[PDB]
A paper describes a structure:
In this study, we characterised the TphC SBP that is a key component in the cellular uptake of TPA, the breakdown product of PET plastic. TphC belongs to the TTT family in Commamonas sp. strain E6 and through biochemical and structural analysis, the ligand-binding properties and 3D structure were determined in both open and ligand-bound closed forms. As with the tripartite ATP-independent periplasmic (TRAP) class of SBP-dependent transporters, they are symporter proteins driven by an electrochemical ion-gradient, rather than ATP as per the SBP-dependent class of ABC transporters. Here, we report the biochemical and structural characterisation of TphC in both open and TPA-bound closed conformations. This analysis demonstrates the narrow ligand specificity of TphC towards aromatic para-substituted dicarboxylates, such as TPA and closely related analogues.
In order to understand the open structure of TphC, we sought to crystalise TphC alone. Residues (P28-D37, PFSAGGTAD) map to the motif [P∗-F-X-A-G∗-G∗-X-X-D∗] which is highly conserved in TTT-SBPs (conserved residues underlined).
Residue numbers in the entry:
A (entry chain A): 21 to 314
B (entry chain B), D (entry chain F), E (entry chain D): 20 to 312
C (entry chain E), F (entry chain C): 21 to 312
Amino acid sequence: NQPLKIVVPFSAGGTADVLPRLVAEKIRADYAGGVIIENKPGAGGNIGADLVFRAPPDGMTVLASPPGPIAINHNLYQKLSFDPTRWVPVTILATVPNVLVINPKLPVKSLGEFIAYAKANPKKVTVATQGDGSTSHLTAAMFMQLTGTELTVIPYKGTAPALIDLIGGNVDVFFDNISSSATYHQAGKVRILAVADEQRSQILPQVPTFAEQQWPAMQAVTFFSVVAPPGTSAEIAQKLQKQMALALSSNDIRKHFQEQGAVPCGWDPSKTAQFIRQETEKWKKVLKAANVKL
Amino acid sequence: SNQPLKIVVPFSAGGTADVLPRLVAEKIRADYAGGVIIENKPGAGGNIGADLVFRAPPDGMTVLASPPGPIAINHNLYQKLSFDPTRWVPVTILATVPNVLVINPKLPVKSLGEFIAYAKANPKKVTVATQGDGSTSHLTAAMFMQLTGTELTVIPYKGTAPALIDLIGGNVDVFFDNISSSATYHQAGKVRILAVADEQRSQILPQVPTFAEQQWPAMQAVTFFSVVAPPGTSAEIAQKLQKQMALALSSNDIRKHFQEQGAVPCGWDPSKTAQFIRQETEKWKKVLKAANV
Amino acid sequence: NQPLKIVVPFSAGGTADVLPRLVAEKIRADYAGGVIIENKPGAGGNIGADLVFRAPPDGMTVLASPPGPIAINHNLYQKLSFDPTRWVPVTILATVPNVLVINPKLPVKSLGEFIAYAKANPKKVTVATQGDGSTSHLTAAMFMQLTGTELTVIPYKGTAPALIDLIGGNVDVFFDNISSSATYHQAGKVRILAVADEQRSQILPQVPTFAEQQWPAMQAVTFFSVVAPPGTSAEIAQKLQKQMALALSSNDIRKHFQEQGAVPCGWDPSKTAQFIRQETEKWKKVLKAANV
Amino acid sequence: SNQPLKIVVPFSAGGTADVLPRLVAEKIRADYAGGVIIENKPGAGGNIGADLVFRAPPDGMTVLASPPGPIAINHNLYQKLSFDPTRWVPVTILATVPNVLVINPKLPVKSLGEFIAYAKANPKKVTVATQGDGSTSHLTAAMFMQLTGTELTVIPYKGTAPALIDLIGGNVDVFFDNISSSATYHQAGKVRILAVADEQRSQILPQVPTFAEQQWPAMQAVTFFSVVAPPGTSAEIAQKLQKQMALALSSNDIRKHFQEQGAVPCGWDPSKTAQFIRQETEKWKKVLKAANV
Amino acid sequence: SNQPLKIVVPFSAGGTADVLPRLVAEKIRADYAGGVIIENKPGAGGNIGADLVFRAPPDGMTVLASPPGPIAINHNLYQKLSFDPTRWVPVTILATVPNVLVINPKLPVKSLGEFIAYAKANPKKVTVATQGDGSTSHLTAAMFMQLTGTELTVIPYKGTAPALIDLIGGNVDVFFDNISSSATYHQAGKVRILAVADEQRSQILPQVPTFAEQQWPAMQAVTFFSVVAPPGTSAEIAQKLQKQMALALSSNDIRKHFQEQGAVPCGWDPSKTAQFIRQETEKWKKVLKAANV
Amino acid sequence: NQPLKIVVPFSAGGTADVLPRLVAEKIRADYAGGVIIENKPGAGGNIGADLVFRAPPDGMTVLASPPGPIAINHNLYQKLSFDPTRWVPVTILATVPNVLVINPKLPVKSLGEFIAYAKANPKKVTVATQGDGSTSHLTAAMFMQLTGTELTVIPYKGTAPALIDLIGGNVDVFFDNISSSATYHQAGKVRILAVADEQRSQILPQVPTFAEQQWPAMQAVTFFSVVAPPGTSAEIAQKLQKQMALALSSNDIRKHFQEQGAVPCGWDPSKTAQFIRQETEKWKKVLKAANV
């Protein structure tokens, strides 16, 4: 019969695309018609999100996305064609931590010294972002708010131009995801001072968390969710989450996740909904205190 | 006709954009039995007020007195406008006010030449205050960056006051302000004006040299205040109004009140006004393009 | 040597402030101590009115005000600290006319067609106001009572949001003052169909009056009055009116008035007193009927 | 020179502090080929604007026009200032506006004498409104207390408007306001002004007696408006500007406009101006001392 | 114990607010040797009658039976009240009556979903009747707009009756009425009820769906009828009365009579009641803030 | 072995100093190196707080303070060198309640009549404070906000001048702590009408709480906390809390605390952390609404 269709509201290739396709190959065994993955990029995930939001609530069309259209965009975009608060949560596939990365020529050797250095030179230290609302912008804003520091933003079109400047010393700080920066940290081109998560990342087992360094409130991960259209029954959503939780349990899948810097979750629909609710409220505070609404 | 002339200033009352046309209105009231009405119609960088004039009857009884936004910039700056600035019927240029290079005094530089070299040795390390993308201070800083081969990191501010606060405090390094705003802080040692981006020095600060005197004649960045009439206004009607305004601008007391705003009267004829507006439009179009704003 | 004091019971900047300050420049010559103008806004003019109503009736403290505390508010507010029927009238400085403004998409191109259109579609045409008792509401109610038309009232918190909706086609008609709507008419964003005054306004010389379109009774202007405290002698009022009528005669001040959309008047105290009584009874009637 | 004169008023536009210098400015524009600029630089009781002139060149092309705060008060009120008001070069005194004793009408006293007796018979029972320690209404009330040996309980307010609300409403008993602010409420019976703290009566209220008339000549408390120039300004330069402003202050229209603000023009020469400021500085420094104990 | 219980209904006799407590009164008379008085004390949206109970002795012999105005709404709607609803001692919720979305039948939509899409595609073009700011129909309209991100133009009316006349006559487009009022007109085809803002359908019109089952479960807007006691009434006294009323609400005759008003009996205990009132209070406080700027 | 160091960010001799020292003597048996108490006064407790906020987070340096640097000062001072939200809570040692004190000449005998007397005469009743931010100011504002009464604020440089005027009838009410006003209440020089706590104070057993007079939301106590530097493990905080809870359980500690008007608490670190957040948000709201 009918295949399950999973819409990733981003282009193919990245972690946003890799993780749902990995899961798809495992649950293909549960669907007689198969599993279609489609990439529908545009407007921070809002174009692809709208196509699932309007689809029939039978659990045969779902959206697999990082937090944009799930938890952020209704507080970032002045107007949306859909309400993320009406999504039917299915599960959280995984999380990927963000990290504090610095150019090595900054005269600091620790997180604490870097905070003192920024406090003593307000607005003199520059921080790279991917534009207003981007994960790296929001994480820098959370960091600034928690630590009482003021960093001067420099927006970049992509991760690659940001790192080129970070390595060259033309921008001082960057709140990147661990998978992007690890290789440059290992080669000494940049320095990762802390991971904004509850545990360290096995990509860089020696890099400590913010929490180990007296900053447990600094929690900033990119979480990959599966949501169903409004009106999807709790039963249908449970059945799919349990298919995906079983898919996420094998060992090869967990390795392929770790290779993206991602830890599998597979929480039930109730924990998923509570997590999205908490993350939504967290970033709303950050956006408001930073006065960011595009 | 006993119908008053109406002048729309597409910005809030007070400020140079409002002062200069109201000064001129006092004089040309003698030319209008029904008088002269000045209205302030702020909104959207001047576009809201511009649009109200753009759609008015082309009889020369409704004109727009505005700085360059809806005259020569916003159609290259905004995604989409409800009007086309290239179809304005030019009347005259009322005045120009020059922008200047202002630096925080802590910068280890004594001259424009040393500042330029300092910025070159430290790409993106020197910060520049702006009033947002497209504002005169952003466009002036972009022109400077493009001419001199330097890279300054932009910090946008909501108004001029918060930007000067940070400049005096050392939280931002540079600001391309207008001479009138920064003069008092320069005289007090709170900031340092290094160069006026104009053809002549400003009498506000007779000792501050231009960029052109310091090996940079291309750095020319003034705010010009124009009068324009709706599309289809005859050249005869436009020239009659320009001659009235030109006579207004020749009084000595009007020129003093202009100088007190940092402004130099112009009053050029519609042909030279149209040519100036085309030159400035293309100048800033190239600057916006190179900066990709 | 004591200066004349003129209290304007409204904030600085608007026409209520401009016109008495223009007259003040001219009559400073009759007062060795000068002329003070104070703005005392609050409660639709009532706060400032109360301050003058309690002042000594020697002619050295006057209220210059639009109609609210002069002719309307005692029939609008449930209680006032002053009685507008005891004001000692000095003069009417000027009038500014109200106008009939429509969204341009209404399938009507004249006053006559608009009245007919509303007749054939009772309650289908909506009219913006600024609350009950506001000038746009009273003028709308008068229009309905004279033409026997039925308009559905949509209230707004101010003129700016009303005009936004009128221009956007979310409300159909608005009875504005001429100086507010003129620029939007010239821009084609609205259409003024008629001026509720005896003569056309020189701001929009081609816009006809109600009177020349067979509705002379539709007379709705904001008048700017000067009044003195209770018990001010008739002679003291006459003397002040003469000073102000002389101030209103120069060309320059009359032109500055027209720039506000205002025609200078300067009527003597007897004609001013009769005018205010007529206006007072007119708006009382309009209120009663609209409130039914 | 073609450089304009700059007058900094270290307060917001629109009040008496701004109105009086602006009136003088228009009259002396004829003396300056470059015109006269007036800027409003508010902040910190006048010290922000004051500092900007104190640091400007002492050529007489930048001067401060201000009420007494940064001229005679604030170095004895604030802990640390960036400038020493005793080093100002005085130019002239533009005008004075007197402060007055205003009471709630329900107080069972009809005259200043009866009020002073009433406060004596009920120490600390009569409450007095202020705008905070150091404000004119506070210093004037403290002078009154020290002179008459009375004790009033001090209730501070954020500004004049809420103080007057409470005075009219009987929530505070007394207020030492300036005559211009309270006159309309006195005329309406909402308050009663008992005495003007000046050498002569105010023509706004010709029937209100002075403290002097009622055997208290020492109660002299006016807001005086000064023009001062930066340290190092020559006596000759200060004299030249004072003579220009004296001529402006002698005209009859200036007189009337000043009176409409409750102000009387002065225009004293720089030597009398300096002596007046020294005396007021000592007076208010003495009052601040006794008050803080 | 020989004193009658007194129930004050702060509205006029005749309506649901009067019917439901009077039905309950007939059953609980068995518990009061002196009987049960019901008084109607209308005025100021319930605040006059509420004040009379709020000030009564907290012995449980005087209670207020009221819809939400003076229980959960008015202290966030009126600028000031003589009493604080958050200090009421809750007893029980007697019943809920749901509000519904009612449209003129000429609107080119046949379902809630089509209506929402139509409004979003024509912002401010669809008009909505209310009974003034703060009225139940206005608050329910504002909640609908905030949840759905739609914009409706508000037309206020003096009461329900003129609103329905205009709705039926096509002079206003939508009205958020209570089910009991619109049902007959829906059945006659003079209006179309599209959805009920409640957890379950109303038996008045079993075929009309809820917002919830059409994917809008957050659209929950009912008129709830509460019994509250004066501040300081012991929890025990409140429990005793709630238990008496819950027993009355379980009788078959009373439930039927409640359904005839469009009301569902509740009878919750004082703790669940207090929770619901807090939730509803916060709910409408948010709607009021987001609505009035 | 290294002593435990307790920094009290206020001068010796007051209740803030007495209570931690009493506890220290009881926990000296748990520390082979002893227990040091230091007084580091200055800037409302901020100077001494800063010295602990920067100390090694090993449980050997702790701050024992009233609420200023624990829950208030970041919402009151423009900038602090530390962030109170990052303190690692240990325990609440004790609370001391504030009370409503009036001059005996007010024509009221109860809290009820006082609230009514002020409602009927807004702004006529005056209230003494120690300046904006002081506990007497914050408690007065909370009262005003909860009861919708309006009192006119008279500030004083300290408690003693305020009591002089309260007794003298130059100010009408004062929200003092129980220990300061009790003696004057017993002498009839003031009248305490209500204690802003959950239970009555044994210093004045006959004086009722706000809560038993139908105002339980009126809870205003000075609480004395122990906090550890940021990053102090929860285990270290728990060990210290358990030591202080034992010290707080002795009857002789109860008595010495009561003699200060204090009741021992000794709650675990989780309840302590919850309490501090509740009090922080409480007084943040009071400040906001007060400054408007």
